[PDB]
Amino acid sequence: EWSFT
Amino acid sequence: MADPEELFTKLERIGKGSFGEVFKGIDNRTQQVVAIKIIDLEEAEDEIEDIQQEITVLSQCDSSYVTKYYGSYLKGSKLWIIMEYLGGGSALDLLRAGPFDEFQIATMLKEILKGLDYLHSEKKIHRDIKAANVLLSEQGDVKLAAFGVAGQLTNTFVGTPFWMAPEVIQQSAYDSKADIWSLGITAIELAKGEPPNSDMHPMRVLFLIPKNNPPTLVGDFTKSFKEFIDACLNKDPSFRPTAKELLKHKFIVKNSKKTSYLTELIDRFKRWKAE
Amino acid sequence: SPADIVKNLKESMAVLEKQSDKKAEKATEEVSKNLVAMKEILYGTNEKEPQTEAVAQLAQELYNSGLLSTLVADLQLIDFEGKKDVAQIFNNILRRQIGTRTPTVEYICTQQNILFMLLKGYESPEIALNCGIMLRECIRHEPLAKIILWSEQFYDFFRYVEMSTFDIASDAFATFKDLLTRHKLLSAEFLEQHYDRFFSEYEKLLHSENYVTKRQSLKLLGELLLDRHNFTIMTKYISKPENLKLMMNLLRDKSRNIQFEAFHVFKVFVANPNKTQPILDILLKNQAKLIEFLSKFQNDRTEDEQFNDEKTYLVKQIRDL
């Protein structure tokens, strides 16, 4: 799962 | 936002043997019986634009000699194509309970020929003409299965070369006259129960069809029937009559009857089958 | 005659407009017989040829009567096979020219509102498809394509291509595609002059609940970028970090095809010889998990050569920062 925040 | 699973009810699969993709169904709103095709689109992945072209072409037809298209519904990634369903069954199914009159054969061919006439005029072709795609209403109306319908300008295949025209086989430049050829085979098929060289291996067939003399109607059939067939089955496409021309051939004219009479066949079949 | 045939057809046309029943079944049948002999003249009877002298004399007797505008204005009133004729006849004229110049183009340049009547046809389901066949024949000509792409009615597509009818939704997207593609030197001039609004609405497409809409838009984004004429737009796109935020997620999509389609937009961000800061902020923060992803991402696709080349490459890029 990508981390943007 | 329209869920087809609520809108339609899937019943038995028409692929009673065949495509695990086509079912008999009911329009829950109208209660009218439909044929429902379900296409994966994920698994297909090969030009959704193709499948859509296949549909736009189908939707362009309003002949009562070609099966109607009613619309399409997307649930997730599966697409439901809804088409006109034909209670009578197919000419091939009907054949299972005994042979046909030259009258019955000619009645059907007349109808198919009209379908073909309509399709040809719109620069369309059929591409899959065979006893199995000659469908009947319970009233006895005869029409072409939607399966084949295609534009002349264009899993993209046919499974068996039996009804295939010699030029088609040779990848040659081909047109509506190749439909005419298949009709020829369909005729022999209705007369005989199976197309020329049924017993043969499809690979071997493919190389005979262009090399050998065209097949012919054999045995207890009138001269004009045979002559009809010899007309269709000309190796040279240009020497093949058009659909329109065949409509007024001594065999058709002498032998067509009202399509209502075809219900003898339906009835016979219904009587014949177990269950 | 070609002269009277348009006059005989214009009367039955006007008659049907703003009506009945007994005189409607008789009247609407008349327009049909008219439209067939109409189409007969434009497609050469059985005398082999369309004459080109009879076809010329007919062609002029049409802009002069101006019935074409209203014929489109009341297409709903025609019958199925007649509607089929209408397009078939129209499609002939739109094409025909002396050689030097297409007169149909210059004529529609005059009577302008005729074009947007067709784009409006996308709201009538009984007329929507017909209209498609006409417009995609109309977009083929540059001076007609100029009119629509730069129109206010252009941004209607974004909910036309969302219309509940899948057939119609699709057919609309086909026009939509053909506009932003056909004349790449015309199409390119539109996109940088309108980036913000165009891509604002387009971004909604990529978020669609509809699987096909999603797919086709993502695919269409790809082609639009990998284009020599659209270079100035792609660079302006492959630098906004919101655009890369999305693509990355689309790679997690339930669907194989969607992911693969996303990857082809994704790679363009990571191949940039002039990456801008926010892009690197995102790529560096996810570096660890990214090499982890591309290693495992669609390995089943073994014979894809170019794809695997692209993959091994994207990892060098991400690894080396």
Side-chain angles (χ1 to χ4, degrees), chain A, chain B residues 2-46 50-52 54-74 76-122 124-126 128-151 154-210 212-222 224-247 249 251-253 255-256 259-272 274-275, chain C residues 1-3 10 14-15 18-24 27-32 34-38 41-46 49-50 52-54 56 59-61 63-66 72-73 79-88 90-92 95 97-106 109-110 112-113 116-118 121-125 128 130-132 134-141 143 145 151-176 178 180-183 186 188 190 192-203 205-208 210-220 222-225 227 229-235 237-239 241-253 255-266 268-288 290-295 297-315 317 319-321:
Chain A
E1 84 303 326
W2 311 122
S3 185
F4 296 109
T5 173
Chain B
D3 176 33
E5 270 164 57
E6 283 172 329
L7 278 161
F8 299 85
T9 306
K10 266 201 291 179
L11 309 169
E12 200 195 35
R13 173 174 84 199
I14 319 292
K16 206 165 192 157
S18 201
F19 21 47
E21 298 177 297
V22 178
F23 307 84
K24 189 205 190 185
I26 289 181
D27 195 302
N28 293 340
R29 201 251 293 175
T30 68
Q31 285 298 133
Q32 170 201 17
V33 182
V34 290
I36 302 165
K37 184 182 199 185
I38 292 153
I39 283 181
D40 212 292
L41 284 188
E42 193 76 35
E43 305 320 290
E45 82 199 288
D46 59 74
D50 275 32
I51 298 192
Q52 287 159 139
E54 190 193 325
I55 299 164
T56 48
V57 67
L58 224 210
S59 57
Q60 287 177 353
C61 308
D62 203 35
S63 162
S64 54
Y65 308 112
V66 176
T67 76
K68 258 67 172 288
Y69 166 74
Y70 297 147
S72 56
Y73 301 85
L74 183 64
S77 71
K78 282 139 152 67
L79 182 60
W80 293 42
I81 301 181
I82 287 85
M83 284 163 312
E84 184 188 348
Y85 177 95
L86 281 133
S90 80
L92 191 65
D93 293 336
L94 295 184
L95 266 194
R96 288 217 289 144
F100 297 163
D101 305 357
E102 275 178 47
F103 291 130
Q104 291 163 341
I105 284 183
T107 303
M108 286 169 178
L109 295 171
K110 193 197 209 168
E111 305 310 298
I112 302 295
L113 267 157
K114 285 157 171 174
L116 286 180
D117 189 27
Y118 175 96
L119 282 188
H120 292 192
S121 330
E122 272 143 273
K124 292 179 184 90
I125 56 133
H126 194 274
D128 196 24
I129 309 187
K130 35 154 75 194
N133 295 324
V134 175
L135 310 178
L136 281 75
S137 66
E138 24 251 314
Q139 296 78 45
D141 315 322
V142 166
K143 35 184 82 216
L144 281 162
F147 196 135
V149 204
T154 52
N155 285 66
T156 57
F157 73 101
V158 159
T160 51
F162 295 132
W163 300 257
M164 248 180 252
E167 65 272 24
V168 161
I169 278 160
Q170 294 175 325
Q171 329 278 312
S172 193
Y174 85 84
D175 59 344
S176 72
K177 296 312 198 54
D179 279 6
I180 289 316
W181 174 290
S182 299
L183 188 65
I185 312 294
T186 306
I188 301 197
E189 183 184 18
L190 298 164
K192 292 281 219 179
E194 45 173 18
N197 304 289
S198 297
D199 54 338
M200 254 167 54
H201 190 225
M203 286 297 309
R204 187 157 32 117
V205 178
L206 266 167
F207 290 88
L208 291 206
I209 294 176
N212 291 10
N213 289 330
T216 58
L217 167 63
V218 150
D220 204 45
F221 302 87
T222 81
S224 44
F225 192 12
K226 300 196 193 188
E227 288 184 330
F228 182 88
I229 283 170
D230 300 7
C232 294
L233 300 185
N234 201 293
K235 296 274 280 298
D236 193 351
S238 59
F239 293 177
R240 280 176 218 149
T242 75
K244 224 161 215 304
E245 303 179 319
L246 281 166
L247 266 155
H249 180 284
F251 172 74
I252 291 304
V253 192
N255 301 277
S256 311
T259 76
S260 89
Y261 295 99
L262 287 184
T263 64
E264 185 233 291
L265 288 185
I266 282 103
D267 292 335
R268 185 185 61 166
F269 179 57
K270 303 229 267 162
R271 176 173 150 268
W272 179 75
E275 269 176 330
Chain C
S1 62
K10 206 276 296 296
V15 157
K18 298 89 200 282
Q19 255 271 41
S20 51
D21 296 298
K22 316 294 147 60
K23 41 272 182 197
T28 58
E29 201 257 26
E30 185 84 338
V31 201
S32 219
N34 275 102
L35 277 154
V36 177
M38 260 277 320
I41 288 174
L42 301 149
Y43 291 94
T45 174
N46 205 35
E49 286 299 311
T52 214
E53 278 90 69
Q60 195 72 69
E61 173 74 292
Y63 339 103
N64 297 7
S65 54
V72 168
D79 64 318
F80 182 93
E81 227 72 37
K83 278 133 64 66
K84 280 235 294 276
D85 277 339
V86 177
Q88 183 71 344
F90 182 100
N91 277 49
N92 182 304
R95 292 181 187 276
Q97 92 268 178
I98 301 91
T100 52
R101 45 90 193 179
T102 45
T104 326
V105 165
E106 291 154 1
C109 284
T110 315
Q112 286 279 274
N113 203 81
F116 313 101
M117 280 224 79
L118 273 63
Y122 278 92
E123 295 180 29
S124 283
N130 284 300
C131 291
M134 305 270 219
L135 262 171
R136 281 184 309 282
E137 158 74 34
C138 287
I139 294 315
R140 292 187 79 259
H141 306 90
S151 75
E152 169 60 37
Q153 297 87 282
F154 177 87
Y155 305 85
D156 286 35
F157 281 88
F158 300 103
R159 293 287 187 94
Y160 284 157
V161 307
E162 289 286 42
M163 149 74 148
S164 36
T165 296
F166 171 96
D167 278 12
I168 293 162
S170 304
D171 186 26
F173 198 107
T175 311
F176 190 73
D178 189 43
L180 316 152
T181 52
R182 184 142 282 276
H183 315 116
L186 165 69
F190 170 66
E192 355 87 298
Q193 232 275 88
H194 295 88
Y195 183 105
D196 318 322
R197 182 189 178 184
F198 183 70
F199 283 104
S200 195
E201 288 286 75
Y202 207 93
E203 193 208 349
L205 286 184
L206 315 145
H207 286 100
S208 182
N210 184 308
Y211 159 84
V212 182
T213 308
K214 200 151 143 201
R215 194 222 190 107
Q216 307 298 59
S217 310
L218 181 47
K219 198 202 175 195
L220 180 64
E223 172 187 327
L224 283 188
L225 307 175
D227 174 66
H229 296 108
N230 283 310
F231 176 63
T232 322
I233 308 90
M234 78 168 93
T235 33
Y237 188 91
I238 58 195
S239 29
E242 352 293 23
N243 298 338
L244 186 47
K245 281 156 85 84
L246 171 56
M247 296 303 157
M248 285 188 73
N249 287 138
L250 290 168
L251 294 164
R252 301 177 70 69
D253 197 68
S255 158
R256 183 187 164 78
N257 311 311
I258 296 276
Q259 307 171 343
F260 185 82
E261 275 300 325
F263 173 92
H264 293 305
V265 179
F266 170 85
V268 209
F269 278 93
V270 199
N272 201 337
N274 196 100
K275 283 179 188 64
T276 59
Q277 198 54 75
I279 297 304
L280 290 99
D281 286 11
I282 300 177
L283 285 164
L284 262 161
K285 224 283 101 188
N286 297 282
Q287 188 179 46
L290 269 178
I291 303 155
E292 160 74 343
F293 183 75
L294 301 187
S295 56
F297 177 62
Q298 286 175 28
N299 299 313
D300 61 287
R301 222 178 278 245
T302 72
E303 319 269 289
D304 213 312
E305 197 84 297
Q306 192 211 281
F307 167 69
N308 310 125
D309 284 333
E310 290 174 319
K311 269 198 299 184
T312 338
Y313 179 80
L314 293 190
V315 191
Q317 293 292 292
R319 187 166 150 178
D320 300 356
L321 290 168

PDB file of all heavy atoms in Angstrom, chain B residues 11-24 85 93 96 269 273-275, unseen atoms left out:
ATOM      1  N   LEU B  11     -31.649 -18.569 -17.411  1.00  0.00           N
ATOM      2  CA  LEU B  11     -32.183 -19.925 -17.359  1.00  0.00           C
ATOM      3  C   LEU B  11     -31.162 -20.881 -17.978  1.00  0.00           C
ATOM      4  O   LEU B  11     -29.970 -20.612 -17.863  1.00  0.00           O
ATOM      5  CB  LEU B  11     -33.563 -19.991 -18.018  1.00  0.00           C
ATOM      6  CG  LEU B  11     -34.561 -18.942 -17.508  1.00  0.00           C
ATOM      7  CD1 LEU B  11     -35.796 -18.905 -18.392  1.00  0.00           C
ATOM      8  CD2 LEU B  11     -34.926 -19.182 -16.055  1.00  0.00           C
ATOM      9  N   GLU B  12     -31.591 -21.978 -18.610  1.00  0.00           N
ATOM     10  CA  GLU B  12     -30.634 -22.977 -19.118  1.00  0.00           C
ATOM     11  C   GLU B  12     -29.712 -22.384 -20.182  1.00  0.00           C
ATOM     12  O   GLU B  12     -30.066 -21.402 -20.839  1.00  0.00           O
ATOM     13  CB  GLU B  12     -31.335 -24.221 -19.660  1.00  0.00           C
ATOM     14  CG  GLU B  12     -30.418 -25.434 -19.737  1.00  0.00           C
ATOM     15  CD  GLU B  12     -30.960 -26.579 -20.590  1.00  0.00           C
ATOM     16  OE1 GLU B  12     -31.630 -26.320 -21.622  1.00  0.00           O
ATOM     17  OE2 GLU B  12     -30.695 -27.753 -20.235  1.00  0.00           O
ATOM     18  N   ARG B  13     -28.521 -22.962 -20.326  1.00  0.00           N
ATOM     19  CA  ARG B  13     -27.562 -22.507 -21.323  1.00  0.00           C
ATOM     20  C   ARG B  13     -27.832 -23.106 -22.702  1.00  0.00           C
ATOM     21  O   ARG B  13     -27.977 -24.319 -22.847  1.00  0.00           O
ATOM     22  CB  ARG B  13     -26.147 -22.832 -20.877  1.00  0.00           C
ATOM     23  CG  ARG B  13     -25.100 -22.535 -21.926  1.00  0.00           C
ATOM     24  CD  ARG B  13     -23.708 -22.749 -21.373  1.00  0.00           C
ATOM     25  NE  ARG B  13     -23.287 -24.145 -21.434  1.00  0.00           N
ATOM     26  CZ  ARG B  13     -22.302 -24.660 -20.700  1.00  0.00           C
ATOM     27  NH1 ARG B  13     -21.638 -23.893 -19.836  1.00  0.00           N
ATOM     28  NH2 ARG B  13     -21.989 -25.945 -20.825  1.00  0.00           N
ATOM     29  N   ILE B  14     -27.899 -22.237 -23.705  1.00  0.00           N
ATOM     30  CA  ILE B  14     -28.110 -22.626 -25.097  1.00  0.00           C
ATOM     31  C   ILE B  14     -26.919 -23.436 -25.589  1.00  0.00           C
ATOM     32  O   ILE B  14     -27.061 -24.303 -26.472  1.00  0.00           O
ATOM     33  CB  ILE B  14     -28.233 -21.393 -26.009  1.00  0.00           C
ATOM     34  CG1 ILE B  14     -29.076 -20.285 -25.364  1.00  0.00           C
ATOM     35  CG2 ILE B  14     -28.737 -21.792 -27.387  1.00  0.00           C
ATOM     36  CD1 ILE B  14     -30.533 -20.614 -25.202  1.00  0.00           C
ATOM     37  N   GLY B  15     -25.745 -23.121 -25.028  1.00  0.00           N
ATOM     38  CA  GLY B  15     -24.550 -23.972 -25.123  1.00  0.00           C
ATOM     39  C   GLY B  15     -24.762 -25.316 -24.428  1.00  0.00           C
ATOM     40  O   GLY B  15     -23.960 -25.729 -23.569  1.00  0.00           O
ATOM     41  N   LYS B  16     -25.868 -25.976 -24.805  1.00  0.00           N
ATOM     42  CA  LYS B  16     -26.227 -27.337 -24.397  1.00  0.00           C
ATOM     43  C   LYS B  16     -25.256 -28.225 -25.170  1.00  0.00           C
ATOM     44  O   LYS B  16     -25.648 -29.036 -26.024  1.00  0.00           O
ATOM     45  CB  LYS B  16     -27.688 -27.617 -24.792  1.00  0.00           C
ATOM     46  CG  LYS B  16     -28.418 -28.671 -23.966  1.00  0.00           C
ATOM     47  CD  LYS B  16     -29.929 -28.591 -24.187  1.00  0.00           C
ATOM     48  CE  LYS B  16     -30.703 -29.417 -23.162  1.00  0.00           C
ATOM     49  NZ  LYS B  16     -32.114 -28.968 -22.973  1.00  0.00           N
ATOM     50  N   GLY B  17     -23.976 -28.053 -24.838  1.00  0.00           N
ATOM     51  CA  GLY B  17     -22.888 -28.257 -25.781  1.00  0.00           C
ATOM     52  C   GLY B  17     -22.748 -26.952 -26.561  1.00  0.00           C
ATOM     53  O   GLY B  17     -23.725 -26.476 -27.170  1.00  0.00           O
ATOM     54  N   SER B  18     -21.541 -26.372 -26.512  1.00  0.00           N
ATOM     55  CA  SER B  18     -21.164 -25.123 -27.212  1.00  0.00           C
ATOM     56  C   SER B  18     -20.665 -24.049 -26.224  1.00  0.00           C
ATOM     57  O   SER B  18     -20.199 -24.366 -25.115  1.00  0.00           O
ATOM     58  CB  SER B  18     -22.302 -24.592 -28.116  1.00  0.00           C
ATOM     59  OG  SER B  18     -21.829 -23.708 -29.118  1.00  0.00           O
ATOM     60  N   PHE B  19     -20.748 -22.788 -26.651  1.00  0.00           N
ATOM     61  CA  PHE B  19     -20.376 -21.619 -25.843  1.00  0.00           C
ATOM     62  C   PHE B  19     -21.054 -21.590 -24.466  1.00  0.00           C
ATOM     63  O   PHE B  19     -22.294 -21.530 -24.370  1.00  0.00           O
ATOM     64  CB  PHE B  19     -20.652 -20.303 -26.604  1.00  0.00           C
ATOM     65  CG  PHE B  19     -21.662 -20.429 -27.729  1.00  0.00           C
ATOM     66  CD1 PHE B  19     -22.880 -21.105 -27.547  1.00  0.00           C
ATOM     67  CD2 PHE B  19     -21.397 -19.865 -28.977  1.00  0.00           C
ATOM     68  CE1 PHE B  19     -23.797 -21.220 -28.586  1.00  0.00           C
ATOM     69  CE2 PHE B  19     -22.315 -19.973 -30.015  1.00  0.00           C
ATOM     70  CZ  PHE B  19     -23.516 -20.650 -29.820  1.00  0.00           C
ATOM     71  N   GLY B  20     -20.223 -21.649 -23.418  1.00  0.00           N
ATOM     72  CA  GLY B  20     -20.654 -21.469 -22.018  1.00  0.00           C
ATOM     73  C   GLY B  20     -20.928 -20.007 -21.694  1.00  0.00           C
ATOM     74  O   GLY B  20     -20.732 -19.547 -20.561  1.00  0.00           O
ATOM     75  N   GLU B  21     -21.406 -19.293 -22.710  1.00  0.00           N
ATOM     76  CA  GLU B  21     -21.534 -17.854 -22.680  1.00  0.00           C
ATOM     77  C   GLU B  21     -22.917 -17.388 -23.121  1.00  0.00           C
ATOM     78  O   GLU B  21     -23.189 -16.192 -23.096  1.00  0.00           O
ATOM     79  CB  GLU B  21     -20.482 -17.226 -23.600  1.00  0.00           C
ATOM     80  CG  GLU B  21     -19.030 -17.489 -23.215  1.00  0.00           C
ATOM     81  CD  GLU B  21     -18.052 -16.893 -24.215  1.00  0.00           C
ATOM     82  OE1 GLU B  21     -18.069 -17.324 -25.395  1.00  0.00           O
ATOM     83  OE2 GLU B  21     -17.269 -15.995 -23.818  1.00  0.00           O
ATOM     84  N   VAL B  22     -23.783 -18.306 -23.544  1.00  0.00           N
ATOM     85  CA  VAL B  22     -25.114 -17.912 -24.021  1.00  0.00           C
ATOM     86  C   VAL B  22     -26.250 -18.659 -23.341  1.00  0.00           C
ATOM     87  O   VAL B  22     -26.292 -19.885 -23.388  1.00  0.00           O
ATOM     88  CB  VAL B  22     -25.251 -18.054 -25.544  1.00  0.00           C
ATOM     89  CG1 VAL B  22     -26.650 -17.694 -25.982  1.00  0.00           C
ATOM     90  CG2 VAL B  22     -24.296 -17.118 -26.237  1.00  0.00           C
ATOM     91  N   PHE B  23     -27.179 -17.912 -22.738  1.00  0.00           N
ATOM     92  CA  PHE B  23     -28.292 -18.499 -21.980  1.00  0.00           C
ATOM     93  C   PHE B  23     -29.648 -18.052 -22.454  1.00  0.00           C
ATOM     94  O   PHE B  23     -29.796 -16.961 -23.009  1.00  0.00           O
ATOM     95  CB  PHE B  23     -28.181 -18.136 -20.514  1.00  0.00           C
ATOM     96  CG  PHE B  23     -26.865 -18.466 -19.934  1.00  0.00           C
ATOM     97  CD1 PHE B  23     -25.809 -17.589 -20.064  1.00  0.00           C
ATOM     98  CD2 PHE B  23     -26.669 -19.674 -19.298  1.00  0.00           C
ATOM     99  CE1 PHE B  23     -24.578 -17.905 -19.545  1.00  0.00           C
ATOM    100  CE2 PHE B  23     -25.442 -20.001 -18.774  1.00  0.00           C
ATOM    101  CZ  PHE B  23     -24.395 -19.114 -18.896  1.00  0.00           C
ATOM    102  N   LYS B  24     -30.634 -18.907 -22.222  1.00  0.00           N
ATOM    103  CA  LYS B  24     -32.020 -18.534 -22.364  1.00  0.00           C
ATOM    104  C   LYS B  24     -32.337 -17.728 -21.107  1.00  0.00           C
ATOM    105  O   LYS B  24     -31.878 -18.088 -20.023  1.00  0.00           O
ATOM    106  CB  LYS B  24     -32.861 -19.797 -22.414  1.00  0.00           C
ATOM    107  CG  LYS B  24     -34.310 -19.585 -22.774  1.00  0.00           C
ATOM    108  CD  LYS B  24     -35.154 -20.714 -22.221  1.00  0.00           C
ATOM    109  CE  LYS B  24     -36.559 -20.640 -22.775  1.00  0.00           C
ATOM    110  NZ  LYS B  24     -37.412 -21.675 -22.142  1.00  0.00           N
ATOM    111  N   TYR B  85     -34.844 -14.292 -28.807  1.00  0.00           N
ATOM    112  CA  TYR B  85     -34.766 -15.735 -28.635  1.00  0.00           C
ATOM    113  C   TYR B  85     -35.811 -16.456 -29.475  1.00  0.00           C
ATOM    114  O   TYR B  85     -36.937 -15.981 -29.614  1.00  0.00           O
ATOM    115  CB  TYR B  85     -34.947 -16.087 -27.167  1.00  0.00           C
ATOM    116  CG  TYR B  85     -34.962 -17.566 -26.868  1.00  0.00           C
ATOM    117  CD1 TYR B  85     -33.809 -18.219 -26.482  1.00  0.00           C
ATOM    118  CD2 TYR B  85     -36.134 -18.303 -26.949  1.00  0.00           C
ATOM    119  CE1 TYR B  85     -33.821 -19.567 -26.194  1.00  0.00           C
ATOM    120  CE2 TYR B  85     -36.153 -19.651 -26.658  1.00  0.00           C
ATOM    121  CZ  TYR B  85     -34.992 -20.273 -26.277  1.00  0.00           C
ATOM    122  OH  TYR B  85     -34.993 -21.613 -25.980  1.00  0.00           O
ATOM    123  N   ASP B  93     -31.457 -28.813 -35.003  1.00  0.00           N
ATOM    124  CA  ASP B  93     -32.209 -29.474 -33.950  1.00  0.00           C
ATOM    125  C   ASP B  93     -33.441 -30.178 -34.505  1.00  0.00           C
ATOM    126  O   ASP B  93     -33.789 -31.272 -34.075  1.00  0.00           O
ATOM    127  CB  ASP B  93     -32.656 -28.459 -32.909  1.00  0.00           C
ATOM    128  CG  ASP B  93     -31.501 -27.867 -32.137  1.00  0.00           C
ATOM    129  OD1 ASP B  93     -30.440 -28.531 -32.073  1.00  0.00           O
ATOM    130  OD2 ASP B  93     -31.666 -26.748 -31.582  1.00  0.00           O
ATOM    131  N   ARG B  96     -33.068 -33.587 -36.117  1.00  0.00           N
ATOM    132  CA  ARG B  96     -32.840 -34.715 -35.233  1.00  0.00           C
ATOM    133  C   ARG B  96     -33.990 -35.707 -35.177  1.00  0.00           C
ATOM    134  O   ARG B  96     -33.847 -36.799 -34.647  1.00  0.00           O
ATOM    135  CB  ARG B  96     -32.591 -34.206 -33.829  1.00  0.00           C
ATOM    136  CG  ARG B  96     -31.249 -33.538 -33.668  1.00  0.00           C
ATOM    137  CD  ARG B  96     -30.684 -33.883 -32.309  1.00  0.00           C
ATOM    138  NE  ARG B  96     -31.428 -33.203 -31.265  1.00  0.00           N
ATOM    139  CZ  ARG B  96     -31.685 -33.726 -30.075  1.00  0.00           C
ATOM    140  NH1 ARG B  96     -31.255 -34.955 -29.773  1.00  0.00           N
ATOM    141  NH2 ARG B  96     -32.377 -33.017 -29.188  1.00  0.00           N
ATOM    142  N   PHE B 269     -40.839 -32.443 -33.746  1.00  0.00           N
ATOM    143  CA  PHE B 269     -39.685 -32.413 -32.870  1.00  0.00           C
ATOM    144  C   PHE B 269     -40.148 -32.515 -31.442  1.00  0.00           C
ATOM    145  O   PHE B 269     -39.701 -33.385 -30.708  1.00  0.00           O
ATOM    146  CB  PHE B 269     -38.883 -31.125 -33.084  1.00  0.00           C
ATOM    147  CG  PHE B 269     -37.674 -30.998 -32.197  1.00  0.00           C
ATOM    148  CD1 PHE B 269     -36.688 -31.972 -32.187  1.00  0.00           C
ATOM    149  CD2 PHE B 269     -37.517 -29.905 -31.377  1.00  0.00           C
ATOM    150  CE1 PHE B 269     -35.584 -31.871 -31.366  1.00  0.00           C
ATOM    151  CE2 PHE B 269     -36.403 -29.790 -30.561  1.00  0.00           C
ATOM    152  CZ  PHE B 269     -35.438 -30.775 -30.556  1.00  0.00           C
ATOM    153  N   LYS B 273     -38.849 -35.571 -28.887  1.00  0.00           N
ATOM    154  CA  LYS B 273     -37.897 -35.501 -27.795  1.00  0.00           C
ATOM    155  C   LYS B 273     -38.407 -36.023 -26.469  1.00  0.00           C
ATOM    156  O   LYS B 273     -39.567 -35.856 -26.136  1.00  0.00           O
ATOM    157  CB  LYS B 273     -37.297 -34.101 -27.651  1.00  0.00           C
ATOM    158  CG  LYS B 273     -38.256 -32.929 -27.609  1.00  0.00           C
ATOM    159  CD  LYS B 273     -37.480 -31.617 -27.783  1.00  0.00           C
ATOM    160  N   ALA B 274     -37.513 -36.672 -25.729  1.00  0.00           N
ATOM    161  CA  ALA B 274     -37.804 -37.174 -24.397  1.00  0.00           C
ATOM    162  C   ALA B 274     -37.595 -36.085 -23.346  1.00  0.00           C
ATOM    163  O   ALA B 274     -36.708 -35.241 -23.492  1.00  0.00           O
ATOM    164  CB  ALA B 274     -36.937 -38.377 -24.096  1.00  0.00           C
ATOM    165  N   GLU B 275     -38.413 -36.140 -22.288  1.00  0.00           N
ATOM    166  CA  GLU B 275     -38.528 -35.122 -21.213  1.00  0.00           C
ATOM    167  C   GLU B 275     -39.747 -34.216 -21.417  1.00  0.00           C
ATOM    168  O   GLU B 275     -40.231 -33.588 -20.473  1.00  0.00           O
ATOM    169  CB  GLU B 275     -37.257 -34.271 -21.038  1.00  0.00           C
ATOM    170  CG  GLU B 275     -36.250 -34.811 -20.028  1.00  0.00           C
ATOM    171  CD  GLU B 275     -34.972 -33.984 -19.971  1.00  0.00           C
ATOM    172  OE1 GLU B 275     -34.594 -33.391 -21.008  1.00  0.00           O
ATOM    173  OE2 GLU B 275     -34.339 -33.933 -18.891  1.00  0.00           O
TER     174      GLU B 275
END
